[PDB]
mmCIF file of C-alpha atoms in Angstrom:
data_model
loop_
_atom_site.group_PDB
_atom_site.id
_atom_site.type_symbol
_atom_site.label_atom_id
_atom_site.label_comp_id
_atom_site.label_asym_id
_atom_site.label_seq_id
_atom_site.Cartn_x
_atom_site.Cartn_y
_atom_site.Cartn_z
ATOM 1 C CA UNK A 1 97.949 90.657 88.690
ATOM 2 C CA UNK A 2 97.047 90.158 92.559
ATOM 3 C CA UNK A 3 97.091 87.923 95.201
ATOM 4 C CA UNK A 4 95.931 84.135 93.550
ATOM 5 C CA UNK A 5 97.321 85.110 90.138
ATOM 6 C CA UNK A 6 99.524 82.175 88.356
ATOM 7 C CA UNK A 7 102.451 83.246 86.998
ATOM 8 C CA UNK A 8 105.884 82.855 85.177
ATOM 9 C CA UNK A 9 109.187 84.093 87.414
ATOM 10 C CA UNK A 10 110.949 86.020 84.757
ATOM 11 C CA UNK A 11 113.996 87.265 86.705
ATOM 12 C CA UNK A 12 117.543 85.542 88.405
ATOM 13 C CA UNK A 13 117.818 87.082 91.688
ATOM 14 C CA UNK A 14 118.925 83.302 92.733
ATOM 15 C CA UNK A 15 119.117 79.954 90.802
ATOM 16 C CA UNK A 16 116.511 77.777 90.217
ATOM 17 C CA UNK A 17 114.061 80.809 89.875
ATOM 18 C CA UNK A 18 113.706 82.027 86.075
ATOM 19 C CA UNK A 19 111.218 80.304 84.226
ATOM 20 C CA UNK A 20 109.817 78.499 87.453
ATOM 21 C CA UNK A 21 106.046 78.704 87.594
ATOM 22 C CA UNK A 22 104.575 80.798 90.554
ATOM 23 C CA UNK A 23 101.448 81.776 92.443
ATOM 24 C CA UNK A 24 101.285 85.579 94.037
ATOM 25 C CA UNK A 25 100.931 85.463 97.808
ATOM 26 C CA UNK A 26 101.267 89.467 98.352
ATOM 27 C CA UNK A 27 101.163 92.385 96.523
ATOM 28 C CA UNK A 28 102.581 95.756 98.054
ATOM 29 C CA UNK A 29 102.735 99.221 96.373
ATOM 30 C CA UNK A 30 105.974 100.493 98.300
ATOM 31 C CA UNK A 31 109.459 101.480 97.180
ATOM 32 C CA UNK A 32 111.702 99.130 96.685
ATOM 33 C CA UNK A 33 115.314 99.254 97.391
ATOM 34 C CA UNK A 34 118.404 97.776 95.590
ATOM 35 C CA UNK A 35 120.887 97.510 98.689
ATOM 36 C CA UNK A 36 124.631 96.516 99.438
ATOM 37 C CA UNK A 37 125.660 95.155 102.797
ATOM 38 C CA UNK A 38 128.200 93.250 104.819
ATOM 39 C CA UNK A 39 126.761 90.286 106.765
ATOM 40 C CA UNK A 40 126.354 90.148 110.459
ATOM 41 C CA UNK A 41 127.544 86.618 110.249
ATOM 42 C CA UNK A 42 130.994 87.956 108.986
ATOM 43 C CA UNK A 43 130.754 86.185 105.559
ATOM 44 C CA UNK A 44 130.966 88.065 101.949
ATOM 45 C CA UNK A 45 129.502 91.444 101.196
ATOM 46 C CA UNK A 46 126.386 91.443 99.267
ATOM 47 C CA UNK A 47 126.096 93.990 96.161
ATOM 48 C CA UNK A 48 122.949 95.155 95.157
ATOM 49 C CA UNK A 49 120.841 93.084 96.280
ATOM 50 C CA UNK A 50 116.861 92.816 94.541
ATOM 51 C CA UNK A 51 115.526 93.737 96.747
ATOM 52 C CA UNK A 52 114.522 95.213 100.380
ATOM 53 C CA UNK A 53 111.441 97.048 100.503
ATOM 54 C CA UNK A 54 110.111 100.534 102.742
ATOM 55 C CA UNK A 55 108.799 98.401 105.531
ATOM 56 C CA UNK A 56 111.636 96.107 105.779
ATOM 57 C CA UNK A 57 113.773 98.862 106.909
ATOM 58 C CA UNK A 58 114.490 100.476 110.488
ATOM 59 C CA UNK A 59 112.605 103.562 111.489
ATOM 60 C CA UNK A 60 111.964 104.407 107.603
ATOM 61 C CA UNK A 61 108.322 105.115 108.532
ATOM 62 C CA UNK A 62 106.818 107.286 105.286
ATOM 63 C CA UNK A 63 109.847 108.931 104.611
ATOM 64 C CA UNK A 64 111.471 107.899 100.812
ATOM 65 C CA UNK A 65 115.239 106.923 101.854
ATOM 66 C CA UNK A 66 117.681 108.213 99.148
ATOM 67 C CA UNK A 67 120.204 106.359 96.938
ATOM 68 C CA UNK A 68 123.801 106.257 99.367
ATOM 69 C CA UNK A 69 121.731 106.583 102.553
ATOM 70 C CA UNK A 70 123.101 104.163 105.474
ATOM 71 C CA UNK A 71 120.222 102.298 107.046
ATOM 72 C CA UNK A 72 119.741 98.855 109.025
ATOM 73 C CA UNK A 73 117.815 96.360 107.337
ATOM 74 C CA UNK A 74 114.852 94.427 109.323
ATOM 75 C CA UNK A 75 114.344 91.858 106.706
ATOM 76 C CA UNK A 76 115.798 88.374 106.987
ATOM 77 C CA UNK A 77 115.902 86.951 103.060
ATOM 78 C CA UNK A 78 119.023 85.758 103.880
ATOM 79 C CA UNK A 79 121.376 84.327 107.082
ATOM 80 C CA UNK A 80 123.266 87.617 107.688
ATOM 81 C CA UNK A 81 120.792 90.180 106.810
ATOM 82 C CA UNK A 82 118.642 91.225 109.781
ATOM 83 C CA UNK A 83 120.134 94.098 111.609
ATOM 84 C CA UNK A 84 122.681 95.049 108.632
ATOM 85 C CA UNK A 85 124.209 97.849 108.239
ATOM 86 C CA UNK A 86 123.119 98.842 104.509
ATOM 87 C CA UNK A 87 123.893 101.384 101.574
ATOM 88 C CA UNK A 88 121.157 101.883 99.290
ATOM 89 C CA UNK A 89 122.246 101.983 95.665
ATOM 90 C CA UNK A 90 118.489 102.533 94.411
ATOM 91 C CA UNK A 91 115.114 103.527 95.387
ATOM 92 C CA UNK A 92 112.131 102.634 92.722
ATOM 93 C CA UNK A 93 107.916 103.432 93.640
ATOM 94 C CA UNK A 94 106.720 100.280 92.138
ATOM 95 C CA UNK A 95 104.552 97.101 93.245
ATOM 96 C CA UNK A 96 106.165 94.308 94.342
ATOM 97 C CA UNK A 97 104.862 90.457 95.155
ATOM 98 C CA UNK A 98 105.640 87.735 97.868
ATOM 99 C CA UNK A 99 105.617 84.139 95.861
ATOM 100 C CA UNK A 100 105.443 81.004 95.920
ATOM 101 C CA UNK A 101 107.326 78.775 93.227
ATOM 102 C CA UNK A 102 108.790 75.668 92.252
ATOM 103 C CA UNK A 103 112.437 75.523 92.616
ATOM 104 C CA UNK A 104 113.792 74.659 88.773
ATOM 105 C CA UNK A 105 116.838 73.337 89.927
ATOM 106 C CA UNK A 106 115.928 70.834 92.845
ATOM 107 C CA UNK A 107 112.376 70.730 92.492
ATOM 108 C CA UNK A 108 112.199 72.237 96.292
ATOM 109 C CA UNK A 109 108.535 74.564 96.587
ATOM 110 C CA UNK A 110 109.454 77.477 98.032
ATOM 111 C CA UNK A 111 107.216 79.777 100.191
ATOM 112 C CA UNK A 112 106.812 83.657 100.851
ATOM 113 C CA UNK A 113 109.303 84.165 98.287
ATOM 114 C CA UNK A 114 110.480 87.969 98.671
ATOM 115 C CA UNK A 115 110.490 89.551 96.473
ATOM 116 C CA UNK A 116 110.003 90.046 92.428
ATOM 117 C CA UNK A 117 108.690 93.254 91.240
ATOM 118 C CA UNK A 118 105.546 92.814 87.964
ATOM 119 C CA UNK A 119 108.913 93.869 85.686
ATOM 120 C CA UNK A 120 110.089 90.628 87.055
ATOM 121 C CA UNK A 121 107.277 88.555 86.186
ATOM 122 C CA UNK A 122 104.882 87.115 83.328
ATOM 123 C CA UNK A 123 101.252 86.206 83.319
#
């Protein structure tokens, strides 16, 4: 699958995603990073979060990060996320994909979608 493929979000990072039907809008080969941080906004920690990716956080450059590693997140998925302080619970070399979908729950289409790795999708 690449960038134009159709298909099937097979994953529940959030609601209103499993099952929804999706169209690829990126494809990266990077490492991707499960991650656990307290918000900058104050609110309630977030615990392992699918997922943050190489280039989404500060001065990472080419350098693989390793599981426990503190680092600040660059990535804004979520109110409370950009400039984080996070602790990486896992690092993975896979592909993942930007989509967009169709919100099961409200019906909502949702762009740029980061992110679902190809173990988190069907064609």
């Amino acid at each position: 699958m690449k960038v134009g493929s159709q298909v099937i979000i097979n994953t529940s990072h959030m609601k209103g995603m499993k099952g929804a039907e999706a169209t690829v809008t990126g494809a990266y080969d990077t490492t991707a990073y499960v991650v656990s941080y307290t918000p900058t906004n104050g609110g309630q920690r977030v615990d392992h979060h699918k997922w943050v990716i190489q280039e989404e956080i500060k001065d990472a450059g080419d350098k693989t990060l390793q599981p426990g590693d503190q680092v600040i997140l660059e990535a804004s998925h979520m109110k409370g996320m950009k400039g984080a302080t996070a602790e990486i619970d896992s690092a993975e070399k896979t592909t993942v994909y930007m989509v967009d979908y169709t919100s099961t729950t409200s019906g909502e289409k949702v762009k740029n979608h980061k992110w679902v790795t190809e173990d988190e999708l069907l064609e």
